[PDB]
Structure 1
Amino acid sequence: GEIVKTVANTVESEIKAELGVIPSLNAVETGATSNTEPEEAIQTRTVINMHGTAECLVENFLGRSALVCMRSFEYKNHSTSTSSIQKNFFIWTLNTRELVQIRRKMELFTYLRFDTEITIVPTLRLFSSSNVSFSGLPNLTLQAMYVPTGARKPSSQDSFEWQSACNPSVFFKINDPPARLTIPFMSINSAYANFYDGFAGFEKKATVLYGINPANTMGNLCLRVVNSYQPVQYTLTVRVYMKPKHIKAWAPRAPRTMPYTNILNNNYAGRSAAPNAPTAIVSHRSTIKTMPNDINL
């Protein structure tokens, strides 16, 4: 382990014709990457590089705010002849696999440990009814409460699990800056696992799904409109952005090539034709001797 502020420099070289020295020849069967340096592989000069490597760090690779949730729900009167349930709220079943870009950057590494900064951005619209008139959006109050594993799940807008006596909750308005807070590293293990080659339960039944981690029970995020229902119908879209910090990564993975189909597992259906086809990840070319982008003069 050595400190690399800038990439390696290049030193000047001369003619090299020596017996028993073969830098260009390598034995990749040993599993070791070829160590042939450019300096004595070819005829080089002296080059000094000031190019920084800070942006290539995992700190900057992952510590960048990415969308992980987007729920849209109706804010209206949901009462009926006998309903008594407002249902102006949503639950998320906390996870980080619904958005493919952030999911792929999670799964570039086997193990990740980080404290995450969470930003909530709400947006409002009016539903287009037969007779609707818009001249402004109300400044509604929204409560986002984290419900940990095994705690009560609110069943309605008017439910009394929204007291948040112990459950952390954040109150914010539409016109206020988007809500922001920080979740510490909250895994029962020493790191989050993007893959779990096993089962989360002791059972041998088909109910226990393969690949479920008995450490990914992150809990739930219950978001509600604090204001009661309005005379006219609205729609609220909440976007939750996740930003890792204080990141350590372990055992880099093979990058995902096929589109994700669900969040429970890493199954894939493949695309109809290349690229990223079942039998064809890279698109076809004419032959191995044709150049697809030939510069012809």
Structure 2
Amino acid sequence: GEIVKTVANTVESEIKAELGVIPSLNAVETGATSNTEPEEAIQTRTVINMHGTAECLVENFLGRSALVCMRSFEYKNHSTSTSSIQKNFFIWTLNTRELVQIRRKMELFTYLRFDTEITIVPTLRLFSSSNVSFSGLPNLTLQAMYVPTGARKPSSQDSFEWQSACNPSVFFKINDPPARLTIPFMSINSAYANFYDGFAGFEKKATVLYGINPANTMGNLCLRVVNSYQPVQYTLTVRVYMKPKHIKAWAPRAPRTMPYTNILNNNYAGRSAAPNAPTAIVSHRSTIKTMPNDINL
């Protein structure tokens, strides 16, 4: 294990006709990748490469803020003949699989240990009714409440589970900067697992699903409009962004090829024809001797 701030330098190489030395030949059967250097495969010049590697660090590769949740509910009076339930909120059931870019990028490793910075971005639209005159978006107070595993969830906007005396909650308005906080590495294990070759229950029943991990039960995010209902219908759209920090990554995986279909498993249907079809990942060319983008003069 050596320090690599810049890519390897190239050393000047000479003609070499030596018996018993075959640097260009390797045995792939050992499981070892070819160790052949350019210096010993061709005649090379001295090159002092000052290309930096900091952008290919797993901290930089995974430590960008990615969307992990998009939920939209109608902000209005949901009350009817006999309901008494205001329903101006949503519950998510925390996960990192709903959006494929962060999922496929996280799924390039088996295990990840990171503290996560979260950013919530709310947006309002007036609901296009029969008689609706627009004149501006109310500066509503929102409450995002993390309900951990085994805590009572809210059933209404007006519920008293919103007390949040011990539940972590953040209050933030529409016209303010998007809410932000850091959640620590909060697994019962020493790393998060993107794949579980097993079951999360002690029973052998169908109801006990394959792939579900007994460390991904992370609880729920409950987000409400704190303001009581307006005289008109609004649509609140909430976007939650995840930025992994202080990242450790283990056991790199084969990248996902087929499009995801759900968040409970890694099943696939594949696309009808190449690319990313079950029988053809790379698009077809005419023959093994055909260059599809051959430069013609």
Shorter-chain TM band: over 0.9
* Rounded Cα–Cα distance in structure 1 between residues aligned with 2:102 and 2:80: 40
Shift of 1:36: 0.2
* Rounded Cα–Cα distance in structure 2 between residues aligned with 1:72 and 1:206: 32
After superposition, residues 163-178 of structure 1 pair within 5 angstroms as: 163-178=163-178
Q: Deviations over 1:128-158 (max 9, x none)?
A: 0000010100000000000000001000000
* Rounded Cα–Cα distance in structure 2 between residues aligned with 1:155 and 1:104: 34
Corresponding residue of 2:238: 238
Shift of 1:66: 0.2
Task: Give the TM-score normalised by the residue count of structure 2.
Answer: 1.00
Corresponding residue of 1:267: 267
Shift of 1:40: 1.1
Q: Name the SS for the 1:55 alignment partner.
A: helix
Q: Name the SS for the 2:17 alignment partner.
A: strand
Q: Deviations over 1:224-263 (max 9, x none)?
A: 0000001000000000000000000000000000100000
* Rounded Cα–Cα distance in structure 1 between residues aligned with 2:7 and 2:270: 38
* Rounded Cα–Cα distance in structure 2 between residues aligned with 1:106 and 1:62: 7
Q: Deviations over 1:249-296 (max 9, x none)?
A: 000000000100000000000000000011000000010001000001
* Rounded Cα–Cα distance in structure 2 between residues aligned with 1:50 and 1:15: 27
* Rounded Cα–Cα distance in structure 1 between residues aligned with 2:81 and 2:7: 71
* Rounded Cα–Cα distance in structure 1 between residues aligned with 2:75 and 2:137: 13
Q: Name the SS for the 1:19 alignment partner.
A: coil
* Rounded Cα–Cα distance in structure 1 between residues aligned with 2:150 and 2:110: 27
Shift of 1:108: 0.4
Shift of 1:172: 0.2
* Rounded Cα–Cα distance in structure 2 between residues aligned with 1:189 and 1:285: 47
* Rounded Cα–Cα distance in structure 2 between residues aligned with 1:14 and 1:214: 59
Corresponding residue of 1:133: 133
Q: Name the SS for the 2:40 alignment partner.
A: helix
* Rounded Cα–Cα distance in structure 2 between residues aligned with 1:40 and 1:107: 37
Shift of 1:164: 0.2
Corresponding residue of 2:110: 110
* Rounded Cα–Cα distance in structure 2 between residues aligned with 1:204 and 1:295: 60
* Rounded Cα–Cα distance in structure 2 between residues aligned with 1:215 and 1:140: 35
* Rounded Cα–Cα distance in structure 2 between residues aligned with 1:49 and 1:106: 31
Q: CA RMSD in A?
A: 0.3
* Rounded Cα–Cα distance in structure 1 between residues aligned with 2:204 and 2:13: 65
Q: Deviations over 1:38-86 (max 9, x none)?
A: 0011010000000000000000000000000000000001000000000
Corresponding residue of 2:290: 290
Shift of 1:29: 0.4
* Rounded Cα–Cα distance in structure 2 between residues aligned with 1:102 and 1:10: 36
Unaligned regions of 5+ residues in structure 2, if any? none
* Rounded Cα–Cα distance in structure 2 between residues aligned with 1:140 and 1:31: 60
Q: Name the SS for the 1:103 alignment partner.
A: helix
Task: Give the TM-score normalised by the residue count of structure 1.
Answer: 1.00
* Rounded Cα–Cα distance in structure 2 between residues aligned with 1:235 and 1:46: 63
Q: Deviations over 1:191-225 (max 9, x none)?
A: 00000000000001000000000000011000000
* Rounded Cα–Cα distance in structure 1 between residues aligned with 2:5 and 2:179: 36
Shift of 1:170: 0.1
Unaligned regions of 5+ residues in structure 1, if any? none
Q: Deviations over 1:146-181 (max 9, x none)?
A: 000000100000000000000010000000000000
Q: Name the SS for the 2:56 alignment partner.
A: coil
Corresponding residue of 1:94: 94
Q: Give the number of equivalent residue pairs.
A: 297
